[PDB]
Scaffold this active site. Structure first.
Site, short mmCIF file in Angstrom:
data_model
loop_
_atom_site.label_atom_id
_atom_site.label_comp_id
_atom_site.label_asym_id
_atom_site.label_seq_id
_atom_site.Cartn_x
_atom_site.Cartn_y
_atom_site.Cartn_z
N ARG A 1 20.14 1.87 -0.93
CA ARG A 1 19.27 2.77 -1.65
C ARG A 1 18.92 4.02 -0.85
O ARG A 1 18.99 5.14 -1.36
CB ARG A 1 18.00 2.05 -2.03
CG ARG A 1 17.05 2.98 -2.67
CD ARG A 1 17.52 3.42 -4.03
NE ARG A 1 16.31 3.68 -4.81
CZ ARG A 1 15.87 2.93 -5.80
NH1 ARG A 1 16.51 1.84 -6.17
NH2 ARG A 1 14.72 3.26 -6.36
N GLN B 1 -7.14 -6.81 -5.54
CA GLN B 1 -7.60 -5.43 -5.62
C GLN B 1 -6.86 -4.52 -6.62
O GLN B 1 -7.50 -3.95 -7.49
CB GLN B 1 -7.54 -4.81 -4.22
CG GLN B 1 -8.89 -4.59 -3.55
CD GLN B 1 -8.79 -3.58 -2.41
OE1 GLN B 1 -7.83 -2.82 -2.34
NE2 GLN B 1 -9.78 -3.57 -1.53
N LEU C 1 -14.10 41.47 -8.25
CA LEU C 1 -12.81 40.95 -7.79
C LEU C 1 -12.97 39.53 -7.29
O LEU C 1 -12.10 38.67 -7.52
CB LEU C 1 -12.27 41.81 -6.67
CG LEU C 1 -11.89 43.23 -7.09
CD1 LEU C 1 -11.56 44.01 -5.83
CD2 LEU C 1 -10.74 43.21 -8.09
N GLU D 1 -21.93 27.16 7.00
CA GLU D 1 -21.67 27.62 5.65
C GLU D 1 -20.64 28.76 5.65
O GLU D 1 -20.47 29.49 6.65
CB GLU D 1 -22.98 28.08 4.99
CG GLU D 1 -22.85 28.65 3.57
CD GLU D 1 -22.30 27.66 2.60
OE1 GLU D 1 -21.14 27.25 2.75
OE2 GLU D 1 -23.00 27.26 1.67
N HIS E 1 -23.69 22.48 3.55
CA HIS E 1 -24.05 23.63 2.74
C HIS E 1 -23.35 23.66 1.41
O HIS E 1 -22.39 22.92 1.20
CB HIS E 1 -23.72 24.88 3.54
CG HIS E 1 -24.28 24.85 4.93
ND1 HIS E 1 -25.51 25.37 5.24
CD2 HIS E 1 -23.79 24.32 6.07
CE1 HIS E 1 -25.77 25.16 6.52
NE2 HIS E 1 -24.73 24.51 7.04
N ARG F 1 -30.85 24.91 9.33
CA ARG F 1 -31.27 24.11 8.19
C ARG F 1 -30.70 22.71 8.10
O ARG F 1 -31.40 21.79 7.69
CB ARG F 1 -31.00 24.84 6.88
CG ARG F 1 -29.60 25.35 6.63
CD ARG F 1 -29.73 26.50 5.65
NE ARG F 1 -28.47 27.16 5.26
CZ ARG F 1 -27.76 28.02 6.01
NH1 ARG F 1 -28.18 28.36 7.22
NH2 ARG F 1 -26.69 28.62 5.51
N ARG G 1 -26.69 18.76 0.99
CA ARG G 1 -26.98 20.01 1.64
C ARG G 1 -28.23 19.77 2.43
O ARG G 1 -28.88 18.74 2.27
CB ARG G 1 -27.27 21.10 0.62
CG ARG G 1 -26.08 21.64 -0.13
CD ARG G 1 -26.54 22.34 -1.40
NE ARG G 1 -26.97 23.73 -1.17
CZ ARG G 1 -27.16 24.63 -2.13
NH1 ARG G 1 -26.96 24.31 -3.40
NH2 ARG G 1 -27.55 25.85 -1.83
N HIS G 2 -28.56 20.73 3.28
CA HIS G 2 -29.78 20.76 4.09
C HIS G 2 -30.91 20.86 3.03
O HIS G 2 -30.63 21.16 1.86
CB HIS G 2 -29.77 22.06 4.88
CG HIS G 2 -29.39 23.23 4.04
ND1 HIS G 2 -30.30 23.98 3.32
CD2 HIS G 2 -28.16 23.65 3.62
CE1 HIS G 2 -29.66 24.80 2.51
NE2 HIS G 2 -28.37 24.63 2.67
N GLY H 1 0.79 -1.21 0.00
CA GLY H 1 0.00 0.00 0.00
C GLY H 1 0.82 1.27 0.00
O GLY H 1 0.39 2.31 0.48
N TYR I 1 12.35 -9.25 -4.04
CA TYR I 1 12.58 -8.17 -3.11
C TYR I 1 12.82 -8.60 -1.66
O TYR I 1 13.56 -7.94 -0.93
CB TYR I 1 11.39 -7.21 -3.18
CG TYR I 1 11.48 -6.21 -4.31
CD1 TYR I 1 10.92 -6.48 -5.57
CD2 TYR I 1 12.14 -5.00 -4.13
CE1 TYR I 1 11.02 -5.56 -6.61
CE2 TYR I 1 12.24 -4.07 -5.16
CZ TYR I 1 11.68 -4.35 -6.40
OH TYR I 1 11.85 -3.43 -7.42
N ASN J 1 -33.15 30.37 0.65
CA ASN J 1 -32.80 29.75 -0.62
C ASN J 1 -33.86 30.17 -1.63
O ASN J 1 -33.59 30.58 -2.77
CB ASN J 1 -32.87 28.23 -0.50
CG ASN J 1 -31.55 27.61 -0.15
OD1 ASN J 1 -31.51 26.52 0.42
ND2 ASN J 1 -30.46 28.28 -0.50
#
Ligand SMILES: Nc1ncnc2c1ncn2[C@@H]1O[C@H](COP(=O)(O)OP(=O)(O)OP(O)(O)=S)[C@@H](O)[C@H]1O
Ligand SMILES: Nc1ncnc2c1ncn2[C@@H]1O[C@H](COP(=O)(O)OP(=O)(O)OP(O)(O)=S)[C@@H](O)[C@H]1O
Lengths: 432, 432
Positions: B100, B134, B313, B289, B354, B269, B219-220, B15, B161, B226
């Site tokens: 190594r 896997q 901006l 949020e 959110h 919410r 999200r809620h 892994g 190895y 909204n």
């Protein structure tokens, strides 16, 4: 979910009580009700003073005391986690025998408490010598009576324990959850962290140290909104604020600090103050001043006027209460965790922050109660020098001789929702 | 200060590349420019396909290739950290020989890069078998060609190895900084964490796992603000929002999830949506949020009207730009770190949050660029099912059949400060 017992393991003078103390505070600080159960304490409430002989293996009489002390302590541990609603009970004692731990794992099993061990292993005569010098010369036991004799009795005391010492075994204890700390944090071995609290503790423990250093806490120099008696916002320094920035740098230079680290918030006033030092510093969004939500930038008068109920309720619980769209002190504390941790990893560090932030930090280092925290006195143009010491931390208040306004607002005697304006504003300090 | 090289160490199918990937993303996510250098990659850009013989110790011809690949990779590592401004280069290869590593420590020493090792040690035939199943059955090398032969060639490959494998030695490597991970995270040994980045990595690594599970992000339900096209605030659910809360619970029940953990923000919410599930859930102030500062609760129109320059901006750099007294997406990401980590420790978890928060989380799990992040599509009443897979994470979008308004505002073609209102509001979606 179910409570936890953290079990200290190790020979005497390995820093178990030091680690017990620090962790307990840390955890409490982050919202986990933790209490320490120090056996040495119980013992003194039992027999008494004189010899290391009390620790002699042949001393069966002594062993009963110690055995009854351990069970007394467990009684307390149980009612603390089972009746008093504690979350973590830290068992502070040598717990050097597989036997003793089993007693514990047993009790734990019976009451359904999870268990985590912290074993402090150190085999450097130097390190241990200093530890005895540092904390044992003045232990209650050794009513500063003897000289080098204290050492004698202590080295002996340790020896007694060295006899049957059975460190946690990677094979025999494979199933247990624990962390072995080697050579004051040089190497660590962690086995089977079960949950959050444990993942947390490992983190804290692997990030604290015992290198002597100082922590200097102060606010930014007096700001324009400070002078106007308005809270929050992102105003710049006043002339006086700018003068203090350099009085501070003068002071800092006078301290002759080795590699000082400097932290600021992202707010202009702390940054500007930092600039005066002529050294690099680091900004942390998490050090920004508490957020007042809808009362951002108001004067206490304008707050009483526009949100009188909020104002009184906040005075009823300044720690937990939030202004609409704002944070509570509880909130701030949570948001400050990352910083506290960074402060633990640092040696000499100066933190230029804000009034509420600073109260939290002081409360952390000086172990004040959350009740006390929102009311600590953090005057402008004053430096608080914190010097950590074995179990504890001394503090020096140093005024830097530059006037500034007073922003401390004490709790009014009347905090009722129906109290009157004057009654709600009578502790407001003079502002221009 | 000076860059860092993180060196992967371990037999094949331990892994390493999985850990390389995850860590690299994590670090990048928290502001540390990290890149992975996978030797297996280089190799394939060299020789080619067929045997484990290429890995045979007698194969001196093969060893040169591998040796030239290692140096090519190092070339890149250097110019990445020395000319391209990277912060951490992760060296992904077996690096099983003291030899190594020395080559590496050498190169490091020459260029002034700090070094940290991650050694993945696992001796469970079961665990390794699955790993090959896997990830190796479909490795480029094994152009899905053979059957059980792939295994054959791989077990052999590993054997090659195993011959000269020299694990980090607690004595001989005492001076080195590293972490040994045993049995997919059951036990760990940490030696000499030098700095922040290392204290950090250890933390991350000791908190991730490989237990298959799913992460549901949503999200809620549609909120009152909204429906009105207003941003931020703490409004409650609309009727439609309340209907979705239960369509969601219906869905969640249909998934037949084992012990599902539920997280919400402290905002009404998300909390209300959570209530619909009839299961305990946990609130996190950090999931609130993003904060719009002075534009809190406005409509984009009111923002264009009152803060046109800010508006343009922000459109120029939605990731870094802040509305006066508000957070940037960069800010949010930082504030979300603790959550991301908690998500790593959890198995099955549903997060009701959110729009901006959710974009950050998706960007994290789906490896989107910060440029891309503030613009991800997080529709209301839609569940995103995230299924982590070896190196990667699939995602399913599931609409729950309850209408809601559209809140996605795309980047206008004109973001100039002098652009006109219509030009600045032409991507605003219909709101009531
Ligand atoms: N991992 C560590 N190894 C060695 N000393 C340390 C460590 N952590 C803290 N110390 C020092 O330990 C000293 C305090 O030691 P104590 O906590 O009294 O040890 P203890 O004797 O294990 O505690 P008691 O006997 O329960 S009061 C202070 O000098 C600390 O610096
Ligand atoms: N500490 C661990 N020990 C064993 N397997 C793990 C661990 N962490 C992740 N895995 C699994 O390792 C597999 C991926 O293995 P790889 O990363 O390809 O191993 P690797 O062979 O070391 O990487 P290469 O050869 O550099 S491509 C996935 O099944 C992961 O679940």
């Amino acid at each position: 979910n179910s409570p936890t017992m953290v079990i200290m393991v190790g020979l005497p003078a390995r820093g178990k009580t030091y680690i017990s103390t620090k962790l307990t505070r840390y955890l409490n600080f982050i919202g986990t009700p933790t209490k320490v159960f120090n056996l040495g304490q119980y013992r003194r409430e039992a027999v008494s003073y004189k010899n290391y002989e009390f620790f002699l293996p042949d001393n069966m009489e002594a062993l009963q005391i110690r055995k009854q002390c351990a069970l007394a302590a467990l009684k307390d541990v149980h009612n603390y986690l089972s009746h008093e609603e504690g979350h973590v009970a830290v068992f502070d004692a040598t717990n050097t025998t597989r036997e003793r731990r089993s007693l514990i794992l047993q009790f734990a099993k019976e009451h359904g408490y999870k268990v985590f061990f912290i074993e402090s292993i150190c085999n450097d005569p130097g390190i241990i010598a200093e530890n005895i010098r540092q904390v044992k010369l003045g232990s209650p036991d050794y009513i500063d009576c003897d000289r080098e004799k204290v050492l004698e009795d202590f080295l002996k005391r340790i020896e007694c324990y060295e006899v049957n010492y059975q460190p946690l075994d990677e094979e025999l204890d494979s199933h247990l959850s624990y962390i072995k700390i080697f050579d004051v944090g040089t190497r660590y071995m962690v086995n089977r962290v079960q949950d959050h609290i444990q993942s947390r503790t490992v983190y804290y423990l692997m990030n604290i140290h015992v290198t002597p250093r100082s922590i200097y806490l102060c606010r930014h120099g007096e700001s324009e909104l400070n002078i106007r008696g308005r809270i929050g916002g992102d105003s710049g320094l006043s002339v006086r604020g700018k003068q203090y920035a350099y009085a501070l740098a003068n002071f800092i230079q006078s301290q002759g600090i080795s590699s000082l680290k400097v932290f600021t918030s992202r707010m202009k006033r702390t940054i500007q103050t930092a600039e005066a030092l002529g050294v690099p510093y680091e900004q942390f969004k998490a050090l920004n001043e508490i957020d007042a939500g809808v009362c951002e930038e108001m004067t206490y008068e304008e707050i009483q006027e526009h949100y009188p109920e909020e104002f009184a309720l906040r005075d009823q619980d300044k720690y937990r209460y939030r202004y609409p769209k704002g944070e509570s002190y509880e909130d701030l504390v949570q948001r400050l965790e990352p910083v506290i941790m960074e402060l633990e990893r640092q040696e000499n560090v100066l933190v230029i922050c804000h009034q509420a932030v600073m109260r939290c930090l002081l409360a952390y280092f000086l172990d004040k109660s959350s009740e006390e925290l929102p009311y600590l006195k953090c005057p402008l143009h004053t430096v608080l020098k914190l010097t950590p010491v074995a179990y504890g931390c001394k503090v020096e208040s140093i005024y830097l001789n530059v006037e500034a306004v007073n922003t401390h607002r004490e709790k009014p005697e009347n905090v009722d929702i129906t109290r009157e304006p004057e009654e709600a504003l009578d502790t407001v300090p003079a502002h221009y």
